[PDB]
Design a binder for this molecule. Structure first.
Ligand SMILES: [Hg+2]
Ligand SMILES: [Hg+2]
Ligand SMILES: [Hg+2]
Ligand SMILES: [Hg+2]
Lengths: 314, 314
Protein backbone atom coordinates (compact mmCIF):
# COMPACT_ATOMS: atom_id res chain seq x y z
CA UNK A 1 0.00 0.00 0.00
CA UNK A 2 1.29 3.44 1.05
CA UNK A 3 4.30 1.45 2.25
CA UNK A 4 5.02 -0.12 -1.14
CA UNK A 5 5.98 3.39 -2.18
CA UNK A 6 8.11 3.99 0.92
CA UNK A 7 9.53 0.49 0.41
CA UNK A 8 11.01 1.74 -2.84
CA UNK A 9 13.23 3.99 -0.69
CA UNK A 10 14.20 1.67 2.19
CA UNK A 11 17.83 2.58 1.52
CA UNK A 12 17.82 6.35 1.20
CA UNK A 13 15.24 6.77 3.93
CA UNK A 14 17.18 4.49 6.26
CA UNK A 15 20.28 6.59 5.91
CA UNK A 16 17.96 9.46 6.80
CA UNK A 17 16.70 8.32 10.20
CA UNK A 18 20.29 7.29 10.85
CA UNK A 19 21.27 10.86 10.09
CA UNK A 20 18.42 12.53 11.99
CA UNK A 21 20.53 12.13 15.13
CA UNK A 22 22.94 14.57 13.55
CA UNK A 23 20.19 16.97 12.54
CA UNK A 24 21.02 19.85 14.87
CA UNK A 25 17.64 21.49 14.30
CA UNK A 26 16.36 18.46 16.23
CA UNK A 27 19.53 18.31 18.35
CA UNK A 28 17.41 18.62 21.47
CA UNK A 29 19.50 20.76 23.78
CA UNK A 30 18.74 23.15 26.65
CA UNK A 31 17.29 26.14 24.77
CA UNK A 32 13.59 25.71 25.59
CA UNK A 33 12.89 29.46 25.58
CA UNK A 34 14.69 32.17 23.55
CA UNK A 35 17.83 33.18 25.45
CA UNK A 36 18.38 36.35 23.52
CA UNK A 37 21.64 36.94 21.55
CA UNK A 38 19.88 35.15 18.63
CA UNK A 39 21.71 32.81 16.24
CA UNK A 40 18.88 31.83 13.85
CA UNK A 41 18.15 35.11 12.15
CA UNK A 42 15.66 33.95 9.57
CA UNK A 43 13.56 31.81 11.92
CA UNK A 44 13.36 34.88 14.13
CA UNK A 45 12.79 37.17 11.16
CA UNK A 46 9.66 35.14 10.49
CA UNK A 47 8.48 35.30 14.12
CA UNK A 48 8.66 39.08 14.21
CA UNK A 49 7.09 39.11 10.76
CA UNK A 50 3.83 37.32 11.57
CA UNK A 51 4.01 39.01 14.97
CA UNK A 52 3.57 42.32 13.15
CA UNK A 53 0.26 41.19 11.61
CA UNK A 54 -1.41 40.22 14.90
CA UNK A 55 -5.18 40.75 15.12
CA UNK A 56 -8.36 40.00 17.08
CA UNK A 57 -11.93 38.82 16.55
CA UNK A 58 -13.17 42.31 17.37
CA UNK A 59 -11.48 43.28 14.11
CA UNK A 60 -14.41 41.52 12.51
CA UNK A 61 -17.63 43.52 12.48
CA UNK A 62 -20.56 41.22 11.61
CA UNK A 63 -23.72 43.17 10.73
CA UNK A 64 -24.41 45.12 7.54
CA UNK A 65 -22.59 41.98 6.50
CA UNK A 66 -25.59 39.87 7.42
CA UNK A 67 -27.53 41.71 4.71
CA UNK A 68 -25.73 40.63 1.53
CA UNK A 69 -26.14 37.14 3.04
CA UNK A 70 -29.93 36.72 3.39
CA UNK A 71 -30.11 38.28 -0.05
CA UNK A 72 -28.50 35.41 -1.96
CA UNK A 73 -29.12 31.97 -3.48
CA UNK A 74 -30.11 29.01 -1.31
CA UNK A 75 -26.82 27.15 -1.67
CA UNK A 76 -24.06 29.78 -1.67
CA UNK A 77 -26.01 30.18 1.54
CA UNK A 78 -25.51 26.56 2.66
CA UNK A 79 -22.11 26.38 0.91
CA UNK A 80 -20.88 28.96 3.40
CA UNK A 81 -22.46 27.16 6.35
CA UNK A 82 -20.65 23.96 5.38
CA UNK A 83 -17.49 25.98 4.86
CA UNK A 84 -17.81 27.64 8.29
CA UNK A 85 -18.30 24.17 9.82
CA UNK A 86 -15.76 22.04 7.96
CA UNK A 87 -13.42 24.35 9.85
CA UNK A 88 -14.81 24.84 13.38
CA UNK A 89 -14.94 21.07 13.81
CA UNK A 90 -12.51 19.62 11.27
CA UNK A 91 -9.39 21.62 10.33
CA UNK A 92 -9.26 24.23 13.09
CA UNK A 93 -9.18 21.34 15.57
CA UNK A 94 -6.53 19.06 14.15
CA UNK A 95 -4.90 22.35 13.31
CA UNK A 96 -4.10 23.24 16.92
CA UNK A 97 -2.94 19.72 17.93
CA UNK A 98 -0.48 19.46 15.02
CA UNK A 99 1.16 22.76 15.87
CA UNK A 100 2.07 21.46 19.32
CA UNK A 101 3.53 18.29 17.87
CA UNK A 102 5.76 20.13 15.42
CA UNK A 103 6.47 22.84 17.98
CA UNK A 104 7.68 20.10 20.31
CA UNK A 105 9.83 18.56 17.53
CA UNK A 106 11.56 21.89 16.85
CA UNK A 107 14.47 22.14 19.26
CA UNK A 108 15.29 25.81 18.77
CA UNK A 109 13.53 28.42 20.98
CA UNK A 110 13.13 31.24 18.44
CA UNK A 111 11.35 28.57 16.42
CA UNK A 112 8.91 27.36 19.06
CA UNK A 113 8.41 31.08 19.50
CA UNK A 114 6.79 31.34 16.10
CA UNK A 115 4.67 28.23 16.66
CA UNK A 116 3.72 29.81 19.96
CA UNK A 117 2.22 32.66 17.96
CA UNK A 118 0.45 30.46 15.43
CA UNK A 119 -1.64 28.38 17.89
CA UNK A 120 -2.72 31.53 19.65
CA UNK A 121 -4.16 32.74 16.36
CA UNK A 122 -5.80 29.40 15.40
CA UNK A 123 -7.64 29.97 18.68
CA UNK A 124 -8.55 33.47 17.55
CA UNK A 125 -9.68 32.28 14.11
CA UNK A 126 -11.98 29.77 15.81
CA UNK A 127 -13.92 32.70 17.30
CA UNK A 128 -14.19 34.46 13.96
CA UNK A 129 -15.93 31.36 12.72
CA UNK A 130 -18.21 31.05 15.75
CA UNK A 131 -18.78 34.74 15.00
CA UNK A 132 -20.04 34.17 11.47
CA UNK A 133 -22.12 31.14 12.44
CA UNK A 134 -24.09 33.23 14.96
CA UNK A 135 -23.89 36.16 12.55
CA UNK A 136 -25.91 34.51 9.82
CA UNK A 137 -27.13 31.06 10.93
CA UNK A 138 -28.50 31.72 14.44
CA UNK A 139 -27.70 28.22 15.71
CA UNK A 140 -25.35 25.14 15.45
CA UNK A 141 -28.56 23.22 14.84
CA UNK A 142 -29.34 25.15 11.66
CA UNK A 143 -26.37 23.60 9.81
CA UNK A 144 -26.87 20.37 7.77
CA UNK A 145 -23.38 18.98 7.05
CA UNK A 146 -22.66 19.74 10.72
CA UNK A 147 -23.24 16.21 12.02
CA UNK A 148 -21.84 13.70 9.56
CA UNK A 149 -18.46 15.29 8.92
CA UNK A 150 -16.64 12.25 10.24
CA UNK A 151 -18.51 10.53 7.42
CA UNK A 152 -17.38 12.62 4.47
CA UNK A 153 -15.23 11.04 1.76
CA UNK A 154 -13.05 14.15 1.88
CA UNK A 155 -12.52 14.74 5.61
CA UNK A 156 -11.96 11.00 5.97
CA UNK A 157 -9.54 10.95 3.02
CA UNK A 158 -7.85 13.94 4.59
CA UNK A 159 -7.21 12.47 8.04
CA UNK A 160 -5.65 9.44 6.42
CA UNK A 161 -3.19 11.88 4.77
CA UNK A 162 -2.06 13.22 8.14
CA UNK A 163 -1.99 9.84 9.91
CA UNK A 164 -0.10 8.68 6.82
CA UNK A 165 2.55 11.40 6.62
CA UNK A 166 2.68 13.16 10.01
CA UNK A 167 1.24 11.38 13.04
CA UNK A 168 2.96 8.15 12.02
CA UNK A 169 5.85 6.45 13.79
CA UNK A 170 7.47 5.48 10.46
CA UNK A 171 8.05 9.09 9.32
CA UNK A 172 10.94 11.53 8.81
CA UNK A 173 10.99 15.16 9.96
CA UNK A 174 11.75 16.62 6.53
CA UNK A 175 8.82 14.55 5.27
CA UNK A 176 6.33 15.51 7.98
CA UNK A 177 7.51 19.04 7.46
CA UNK A 178 6.64 18.87 3.74
CA UNK A 179 3.15 17.45 4.27
CA UNK A 180 2.48 19.93 7.08
CA UNK A 181 3.40 22.58 4.52
CA UNK A 182 1.02 20.79 2.16
CA UNK A 183 -1.74 20.68 4.80
CA UNK A 184 -1.45 24.41 5.48
CA UNK A 185 -0.88 25.67 1.94
CA UNK A 186 -2.73 23.23 -0.28
CA UNK A 187 -5.66 21.95 1.77
CA UNK A 188 -8.32 24.67 1.63
CA UNK A 189 -6.80 26.52 -1.33
CA UNK A 190 -10.36 26.46 -2.61
CA UNK A 191 -12.13 27.95 0.42
CA UNK A 192 -10.05 31.10 -0.10
CA UNK A 193 -10.35 31.14 -3.87
CA UNK A 194 -14.07 30.85 -3.16
CA UNK A 195 -14.66 33.50 -0.50
CA UNK A 196 -12.17 35.68 -2.36
CA UNK A 197 -14.18 35.54 -5.59
CA UNK A 198 -17.40 36.02 -3.61
CA UNK A 199 -16.74 38.95 -1.26
CA UNK A 200 -14.66 40.47 -4.07
CA UNK A 201 -15.77 44.07 -4.72
CA UNK A 202 -19.21 44.54 -3.13
CA UNK A 203 -20.06 41.55 -0.93
CA UNK A 204 -19.96 40.91 2.82
CA UNK A 205 -16.96 43.06 4.07
CA UNK A 206 -16.23 41.44 7.42
CA UNK A 207 -15.99 38.08 5.69
CA UNK A 208 -13.71 39.60 3.05
CA UNK A 209 -11.39 40.78 5.82
CA UNK A 210 -11.37 37.55 7.85
CA UNK A 211 -10.55 35.63 4.65
CA UNK A 212 -8.04 38.25 3.52
CA UNK A 213 -6.29 37.84 6.85
CA UNK A 214 -6.57 34.15 7.69
CA UNK A 215 -5.44 33.32 4.14
CA UNK A 216 -2.52 35.72 4.56
CA UNK A 217 -1.28 34.42 7.88
CA UNK A 218 -1.67 30.80 6.81
CA UNK A 219 0.57 31.77 3.94
CA UNK A 220 3.32 32.86 6.31
CA UNK A 221 2.78 29.73 8.32
CA UNK A 222 3.31 27.41 5.35
CA UNK A 223 6.41 29.47 4.57
CA UNK A 224 7.79 28.57 7.99
CA UNK A 225 7.48 24.89 7.22
CA UNK A 226 9.71 25.66 4.22
CA UNK A 227 12.03 27.98 6.11
CA UNK A 228 12.51 25.02 8.39
CA UNK A 229 12.72 22.54 5.51
CA UNK A 230 15.60 24.49 4.01
CA UNK A 231 17.64 23.98 7.18
CA UNK A 232 17.82 20.19 7.08
CA UNK A 233 20.98 18.50 5.72
CA UNK A 234 19.67 15.19 4.35
CA UNK A 235 16.68 16.03 2.14
CA UNK A 236 13.85 13.71 1.01
CA UNK A 237 14.26 12.19 -2.47
CA UNK A 238 12.41 14.70 -4.66
CA UNK A 239 10.14 11.78 -5.55
CA UNK A 240 8.75 11.57 -2.01
CA UNK A 241 8.49 15.31 -1.92
CA UNK A 242 6.15 15.02 -4.85
CA UNK A 243 3.67 12.27 -3.81
CA UNK A 244 3.04 14.34 -0.73
CA UNK A 245 1.91 17.49 -2.54
CA UNK A 246 0.46 15.29 -5.24
CA UNK A 247 -1.69 13.43 -2.71
CA UNK A 248 -2.77 16.69 -1.10
CA UNK A 249 -3.71 18.23 -4.42
CA UNK A 250 -6.18 15.44 -5.20
CA UNK A 251 -7.64 15.20 -1.70
CA UNK A 252 -8.19 18.96 -1.79
CA UNK A 253 -10.30 18.94 -5.00
CA UNK A 254 -12.68 16.19 -3.82
CA UNK A 255 -14.29 18.70 -1.44
CA UNK A 256 -15.67 20.83 -4.27
CA UNK A 257 -17.05 17.97 -6.33
CA UNK A 258 -18.50 16.17 -3.30
CA UNK A 259 -19.11 18.14 -0.12
CA UNK A 260 -19.15 21.82 -1.06
CA UNK A 261 -20.56 23.01 -4.47
CA UNK A 262 -18.43 25.50 -6.43
CA UNK A 263 -20.78 24.28 -9.14
CA UNK A 264 -23.96 25.22 -7.27
CA UNK A 265 -21.93 27.98 -5.64
CA UNK A 266 -21.34 29.71 -8.96
CA UNK A 267 -18.07 28.76 -10.65
CA UNK A 268 -16.40 26.63 -13.33
CA UNK A 269 -14.95 23.83 -11.18
CA UNK A 270 -12.28 23.04 -13.77
CA UNK A 271 -10.73 26.33 -12.63
CA UNK A 272 -10.53 25.65 -8.90
CA UNK A 273 -9.17 22.25 -9.94
CA UNK A 274 -6.41 24.04 -11.79
CA UNK A 275 -5.67 26.75 -9.21
CA UNK A 276 -5.14 24.07 -6.58
CA UNK A 277 -2.53 22.77 -9.02
CA UNK A 278 -1.02 26.23 -9.22
CA UNK A 279 -0.43 26.64 -5.51
CA UNK A 280 1.04 23.11 -5.31
CA UNK A 281 3.68 23.70 -7.97
CA UNK A 282 4.86 26.96 -6.46
CA UNK A 283 5.05 24.89 -3.30
CA UNK A 284 6.83 22.09 -5.12
CA UNK A 285 9.43 24.57 -6.19
CA UNK A 286 9.77 25.95 -2.68
CA UNK A 287 11.13 22.57 -1.58
CA UNK A 288 13.65 22.22 -4.39
CA UNK A 289 11.35 20.29 -6.72
CA UNK A 290 10.47 20.82 -10.40
CA UNK A 291 6.93 21.97 -11.28
CA UNK A 292 4.38 19.21 -11.86
CA UNK A 293 0.91 20.26 -12.88
CA UNK A 294 2.30 23.26 -14.79
CA UNK A 295 -0.99 25.00 -14.07
CA UNK A 296 -1.60 28.68 -14.68
CA UNK A 297 -3.43 31.02 -12.30
CA UNK A 298 -7.14 31.08 -13.33
CA UNK A 299 -8.20 33.93 -11.04
CA UNK A 300 -6.73 37.37 -10.52
CA UNK A 301 -4.94 36.53 -7.32
CA UNK A 302 -3.14 38.22 -4.45
CA UNK A 303 -1.83 36.47 -1.31
CA UNK A 304 7.27 43.77 -5.91
CA UNK A 305 10.31 45.74 -4.85
CA UNK A 306 11.87 42.55 -3.49
CA UNK A 307 10.58 40.24 -6.23
CA UNK A 308 11.87 42.44 -9.06
CA UNK A 309 15.05 42.92 -7.01
CA UNK A 310 15.86 39.22 -6.86
CA UNK A 311 14.53 38.66 -10.39
CA UNK A 312 17.62 40.64 -11.35
CA UNK A 313 19.86 38.65 -9.04
CA UNK A 314 19.12 35.59 -11.17
CA UNK B 1 11.22 22.69 58.93
CA UNK B 2 8.83 24.02 56.26
CA UNK B 3 7.05 20.73 56.86
CA UNK B 4 6.55 21.30 60.59
CA UNK B 5 4.15 24.03 59.50
CA UNK B 6 2.40 21.81 56.95
CA UNK B 7 2.43 19.05 59.59
CA UNK B 8 0.15 21.26 61.66
CA UNK B 9 -2.47 20.72 58.93
CA UNK B 10 -2.04 17.02 58.11
CA UNK B 11 -5.80 16.62 58.61
CA UNK B 12 -7.32 19.48 56.66
CA UNK B 13 -4.76 19.21 53.87
CA UNK B 14 -5.31 15.47 53.62
CA UNK B 15 -9.01 15.94 53.08
CA UNK B 16 -7.92 18.37 50.39
CA UNK B 17 -5.86 16.07 48.15
CA UNK B 18 -8.63 13.54 48.71
CA UNK B 19 -11.03 16.14 47.36
CA UNK B 20 -8.84 17.34 44.50
CA UNK B 21 -10.17 14.39 42.49
CA UNK B 22 -13.55 16.09 42.66
CA UNK B 23 -12.13 19.47 41.69
CA UNK B 24 -13.71 19.83 38.26
CA UNK B 25 -11.35 22.66 37.31
CA UNK B 26 -8.74 19.88 37.36
CA UNK B 27 -11.28 17.30 36.17
CA UNK B 28 -9.06 16.52 33.21
CA UNK B 29 -11.49 15.86 30.39
CA UNK B 30 -11.34 16.19 26.60
CA UNK B 31 -11.47 19.98 26.16
CA UNK B 32 -7.82 20.66 25.26
CA UNK B 33 -8.67 23.60 22.99
CA UNK B 34 -11.64 26.01 23.27
CA UNK B 35 -14.64 24.37 21.58
CA UNK B 36 -16.64 27.53 21.35
CA UNK B 37 -20.10 27.81 23.02
CA UNK B 38 -18.20 28.95 26.16
CA UNK B 39 -19.27 27.96 29.70
CA UNK B 40 -16.63 29.77 31.80
CA UNK B 41 -17.48 33.38 31.14
CA UNK B 42 -15.11 35.03 33.55
CA UNK B 43 -12.03 32.98 32.64
CA UNK B 44 -12.77 33.95 29.06
CA UNK B 45 -13.55 37.55 30.00
CA UNK B 46 -10.00 37.70 31.31
CA UNK B 47 -8.51 36.17 28.16
CA UNK B 48 -10.13 38.73 25.89
CA UNK B 49 -9.18 41.38 28.45
CA UNK B 50 -5.41 40.92 28.40
CA UNK B 51 -5.78 40.08 24.71
CA UNK B 52 -6.93 43.66 24.18
CA UNK B 53 -3.69 45.05 25.63
CA UNK B 54 -1.34 43.10 23.34
CA UNK B 55 1.91 44.84 22.34
CA UNK B 56 5.35 44.43 20.77
CA UNK B 57 9.00 45.29 21.40
CA UNK B 58 8.84 47.77 18.55
CA UNK B 59 6.49 49.70 20.82
CA UNK B 60 9.63 50.55 22.74
CA UNK B 61 11.77 53.26 21.15
CA UNK B 62 15.23 53.29 22.79
CA UNK B 63 17.23 56.43 21.95
CA UNK B 64 16.65 59.96 23.27
CA UNK B 65 16.09 57.61 26.17
CA UNK B 66 19.78 56.76 26.26
CA UNK B 67 20.45 60.42 27.10
CA UNK B 68 18.80 60.78 30.51
CA UNK B 69 20.76 57.60 31.29
CA UNK B 70 24.42 58.59 30.75
CA UNK B 71 23.51 61.78 32.57
CA UNK B 72 22.92 60.22 35.99
CA UNK B 73 24.63 58.91 39.13
CA UNK B 74 26.99 55.94 39.00
CA UNK B 75 24.68 53.52 40.80
CA UNK B 76 21.14 54.31 39.64
CA UNK B 77 23.19 53.48 36.58
CA UNK B 78 24.30 50.05 37.86
CA UNK B 79 21.05 49.62 39.82
CA UNK B 80 19.24 49.50 36.49
CA UNK B 81 21.78 47.13 34.97
CA UNK B 82 21.27 44.73 37.86
CA UNK B 83 17.54 45.21 37.51
CA UNK B 84 17.64 44.51 33.75
CA UNK B 85 19.65 41.34 34.49
CA UNK B 86 17.95 39.92 37.57
CA UNK B 87 15.18 39.53 35.01
CA UNK B 88 16.71 38.37 31.72
CA UNK B 89 18.37 35.48 33.57
CA UNK B 90 16.38 34.98 36.77
CA UNK B 91 12.65 35.71 36.76
CA UNK B 92 11.86 35.92 33.05
CA UNK B 93 13.26 32.38 32.78
CA UNK B 94 11.55 30.55 35.59
CA UNK B 95 8.66 32.73 34.56
CA UNK B 96 8.07 30.94 31.26
CA UNK B 97 8.54 27.41 32.66
CA UNK B 98 6.02 27.96 35.47
CA UNK B 99 3.33 29.14 33.08
CA UNK B 100 3.50 25.84 31.22
CA UNK B 101 3.22 23.87 34.42
CA UNK B 102 0.13 25.73 35.60
CA UNK B 103 -1.25 25.87 32.07
CA UNK B 104 -0.95 22.09 31.97
CA UNK B 105 -2.65 21.78 35.38
CA UNK B 106 -5.64 23.84 34.21
CA UNK B 107 -8.06 21.47 32.54
CA UNK B 108 -10.31 24.04 30.90
CA UNK B 109 -9.45 25.31 27.36
CA UNK B 110 -10.54 28.94 27.69
CA UNK B 111 -8.15 28.91 30.63
CA UNK B 112 -5.10 27.48 28.89
CA UNK B 113 -6.05 30.08 26.30
CA UNK B 114 -5.13 32.88 28.66
CA UNK B 115 -1.91 31.19 29.74
CA UNK B 116 -1.23 30.76 26.04
CA UNK B 117 -1.24 34.54 25.78
CA UNK B 118 0.88 35.14 28.85
CA UNK B 119 3.94 33.05 27.81
CA UNK B 120 3.93 34.67 24.43
CA UNK B 121 4.30 38.03 26.16
CA UNK B 122 6.99 36.88 28.65
CA UNK B 123 8.88 36.09 25.45
CA UNK B 124 8.17 39.59 24.18
CA UNK B 125 9.20 41.20 27.48
CA UNK B 126 12.50 39.34 27.28
CA UNK B 127 13.32 41.30 24.11
CA UNK B 128 12.42 44.62 25.71
CA UNK B 129 15.06 43.82 28.29
CA UNK B 130 17.65 42.73 25.73
CA UNK B 131 16.61 46.02 24.10
CA UNK B 132 17.52 48.17 27.09
CA UNK B 133 20.74 46.27 27.81
CA UNK B 134 22.04 47.05 24.31
CA UNK B 135 20.37 50.46 24.57
CA UNK B 136 22.49 51.68 27.44
CA UNK B 137 25.13 49.07 28.39
CA UNK B 138 26.56 48.03 25.01
CA UNK B 139 27.40 44.49 26.14
CA UNK B 140 26.44 41.52 28.46
CA UNK B 141 30.03 41.79 29.64
CA UNK B 142 29.56 45.32 30.96
CA UNK B 143 27.22 44.12 33.74
CA UNK B 144 28.66 43.22 37.19
CA UNK B 145 25.93 41.27 39.05
CA UNK B 146 25.48 39.39 35.77
CA UNK B 147 27.58 36.35 36.72
CA UNK B 148 26.97 35.46 40.34
CA UNK B 149 23.18 35.64 40.38
CA UNK B 150 22.91 31.98 41.34
CA UNK B 151 24.91 33.16 44.34
CA UNK B 152 22.65 35.92 45.64
CA UNK B 153 20.96 35.53 49.03
CA UNK B 154 17.78 36.80 47.40
CA UNK B 155 17.55 34.83 44.14
CA UNK B 156 18.56 31.73 46.12
CA UNK B 157 15.99 32.47 48.83
CA UNK B 158 13.49 33.02 46.06
CA UNK B 159 13.95 29.71 44.24
CA UNK B 160 13.51 27.89 47.52
CA UNK B 161 10.09 29.60 47.75
CA UNK B 162 8.99 28.13 44.42
CA UNK B 163 10.49 24.68 44.98
CA UNK B 164 8.82 24.92 48.38
CA UNK B 165 5.30 25.93 47.32
CA UNK B 166 4.95 25.15 43.60
CA UNK B 167 7.37 22.67 42.01
CA UNK B 168 6.95 20.30 44.94
CA UNK B 169 5.23 16.92 44.91
CA UNK B 170 3.67 17.55 48.36
CA UNK B 171 1.58 20.55 47.24
CA UNK B 172 -2.08 21.44 46.62
CA UNK B 173 -3.41 23.31 43.58
CA UNK B 174 -5.12 26.06 45.58
CA UNK B 175 -1.82 26.47 47.40
CA UNK B 176 0.44 26.57 44.34
CA UNK B 177 -2.09 28.90 42.84
CA UNK B 178 -1.73 31.29 45.81
CA UNK B 179 2.06 31.36 45.74
CA UNK B 180 2.07 31.74 41.96
CA UNK B 181 -0.16 34.76 42.57
CA UNK B 182 2.39 35.79 45.20
CA UNK B 183 5.29 35.27 42.79
CA UNK B 184 3.65 37.41 40.10
CA UNK B 185 2.15 40.12 42.28
CA UNK B 186 4.51 40.43 45.22
CA UNK B 187 7.96 39.49 43.94
CA UNK B 188 9.28 42.55 42.10
CA UNK B 189 6.77 45.00 43.60
CA UNK B 190 9.86 47.09 44.18
CA UNK B 191 11.29 47.08 40.64
CA UNK B 192 8.08 48.80 39.50
CA UNK B 193 7.85 51.13 42.47
CA UNK B 194 11.43 51.99 41.56
CA UNK B 195 11.28 52.57 37.79
CA UNK B 196 7.90 54.22 38.34
CA UNK B 197 9.35 56.80 40.74
CA UNK B 198 12.36 57.25 38.45
CA UNK B 199 10.93 57.69 34.95
CA UNK B 200 8.06 59.59 36.59
CA UNK B 201 7.57 62.96 34.87
CA UNK B 202 10.72 63.71 32.85
CA UNK B 203 12.96 60.65 32.71
CA UNK B 204 13.62 57.96 30.09
CA UNK B 205 10.22 57.58 28.25
CA UNK B 206 10.63 54.19 26.61
CA UNK B 207 11.52 52.71 29.99
CA UNK B 208 8.50 54.44 31.53
CA UNK B 209 6.29 52.76 28.93
CA UNK B 210 7.82 49.27 29.19
CA UNK B 211 7.40 49.44 32.99
CA UNK B 212 3.93 50.97 32.71
CA UNK B 213 2.93 48.05 30.51
CA UNK B 214 4.77 45.05 31.96
CA UNK B 215 3.60 46.08 35.44
CA UNK B 216 0.06 46.40 34.09
CA UNK B 217 -0.13 43.04 32.35
CA UNK B 218 1.51 41.23 35.27
CA UNK B 219 -1.27 42.74 37.31
CA UNK B 220 -3.91 41.04 35.16
CA UNK B 221 -1.91 37.86 35.29
CA UNK B 222 -1.88 37.74 39.08
CA UNK B 223 -5.60 38.42 38.93
CA UNK B 224 -6.04 35.25 36.91
CA UNK B 225 -4.42 33.20 39.63
CA UNK B 226 -7.14 34.63 41.87
CA UNK B 227 -9.91 34.26 39.32
CA UNK B 228 -8.88 30.63 39.29
CA UNK B 229 -8.47 30.47 43.07
CA UNK B 230 -12.07 31.59 43.52
CA UNK B 231 -13.30 28.59 41.55
CA UNK B 232 -11.98 25.87 43.86
CA UNK B 233 -14.37 24.23 46.37
CA UNK B 234 -12.05 23.20 49.22
CA UNK B 235 -9.97 26.27 50.11
CA UNK B 236 -6.64 26.39 51.98
CA UNK B 237 -6.89 27.18 55.71
CA UNK B 238 -6.48 30.97 55.75
CA UNK B 239 -3.39 30.31 57.87
CA UNK B 240 -1.56 28.65 54.97
CA UNK B 241 -2.79 31.36 52.68
CA UNK B 242 -0.92 33.78 54.88
CA UNK B 243 2.54 32.19 55.31
CA UNK B 244 2.71 32.11 51.55
CA UNK B 245 2.26 35.86 51.00
CA UNK B 246 4.08 36.45 54.26
CA UNK B 247 7.12 34.49 53.03
CA UNK B 248 7.03 36.29 49.68
CA UNK B 249 6.82 39.69 51.32
CA UNK B 250 10.06 39.13 53.24
CA UNK B 251 11.96 37.50 50.39
CA UNK B 252 10.96 40.43 48.18
CA UNK B 253 12.44 43.12 50.49
CA UNK B 254 15.86 41.44 50.83
CA UNK B 255 16.65 42.46 47.24
CA UNK B 256 16.69 46.16 48.08
CA UNK B 257 18.79 45.87 51.22
CA UNK B 258 21.22 43.40 49.64
CA UNK B 259 21.44 43.19 45.86
CA UNK B 260 19.89 46.36 44.46
CA UNK B 261 20.24 49.76 46.30
CA UNK B 262 17.07 51.82 46.71
CA UNK B 263 19.31 53.46 49.27
CA UNK B 264 22.08 54.29 46.81
CA UNK B 265 19.37 54.51 44.15
CA UNK B 266 17.72 57.44 45.90
CA UNK B 267 14.88 56.46 48.24
CA UNK B 268 13.85 55.85 51.85
CA UNK B 269 13.91 52.03 51.95
CA UNK B 270 11.45 51.92 54.84
CA UNK B 271 8.90 53.00 52.23
CA UNK B 272 9.49 50.26 49.66
CA UNK B 273 9.46 47.92 52.66
CA UNK B 274 5.98 49.19 53.47
CA UNK B 275 4.60 49.30 49.93
CA UNK B 276 5.53 45.65 49.46
CA UNK B 277 3.35 45.13 52.51
CA UNK B 278 0.58 47.11 50.86
CA UNK B 279 0.38 44.99 47.74
CA UNK B 280 0.45 41.79 49.83
CA UNK B 281 -2.55 42.72 51.98
CA UNK B 282 -4.70 43.70 49.02
CA UNK B 283 -3.62 40.30 47.72
CA UNK B 284 -4.37 38.67 51.05
CA UNK B 285 -7.87 40.04 50.81
CA UNK B 286 -8.25 38.84 47.23
CA UNK B 287 -8.00 35.27 48.52
CA UNK B 288 -10.52 35.66 51.31
CA UNK B 289 -7.99 36.55 53.99
CA UNK B 290 -7.89 39.42 56.51
CA UNK B 291 -5.25 42.14 56.07
CA UNK B 292 -1.92 41.53 57.81
CA UNK B 293 0.69 44.25 57.54
CA UNK B 294 -2.02 46.95 57.51
CA UNK B 295 0.37 49.06 55.47
CA UNK B 296 -0.59 52.27 53.72
CA UNK B 297 0.46 53.26 50.20
CA UNK B 298 3.66 55.37 50.49
CA UNK B 299 3.81 56.46 46.85
CA UNK B 300 1.19 58.03 44.63
CA UNK B 301 0.33 54.86 42.79
CA UNK B 302 -1.58 53.67 39.75
CA UNK B 303 -1.67 50.08 38.44
CA UNK B 304 -13.44 54.35 39.11
CA UNK B 305 -16.83 53.95 37.51
CA UNK B 306 -16.81 50.27 38.49
CA UNK B 307 -15.09 50.74 41.85
CA UNK B 308 -17.51 53.44 43.01
CA UNK B 309 -20.32 51.34 41.51
CA UNK B 310 -19.58 48.30 43.66
CA UNK B 311 -18.62 50.48 46.63
CA UNK B 312 -22.35 51.23 46.66
CA UNK B 313 -23.30 47.59 46.28
CA UNK B 314 -21.70 46.93 49.67
HG1 LIG C 1 -3.94 31.15 1.42
HG1 LIG D 1 11.67 27.88 1.71
HG1 LIG E 1 2.73 45.58 39.09
HG1 LIG F 1 -10.06 36.90 42.88
Amino acid sequence: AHNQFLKTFQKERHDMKEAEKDEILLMENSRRFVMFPIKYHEIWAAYKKVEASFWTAEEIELAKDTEDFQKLTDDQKTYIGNLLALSISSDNLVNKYLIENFSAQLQNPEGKSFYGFQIMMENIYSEVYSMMVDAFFKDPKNIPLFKEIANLPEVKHKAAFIERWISNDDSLYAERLVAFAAKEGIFQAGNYASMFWLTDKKIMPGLAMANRNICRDRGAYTDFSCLLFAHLRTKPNPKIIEKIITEAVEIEKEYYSNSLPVEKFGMDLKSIHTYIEFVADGLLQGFGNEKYYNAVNPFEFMEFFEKKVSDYQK
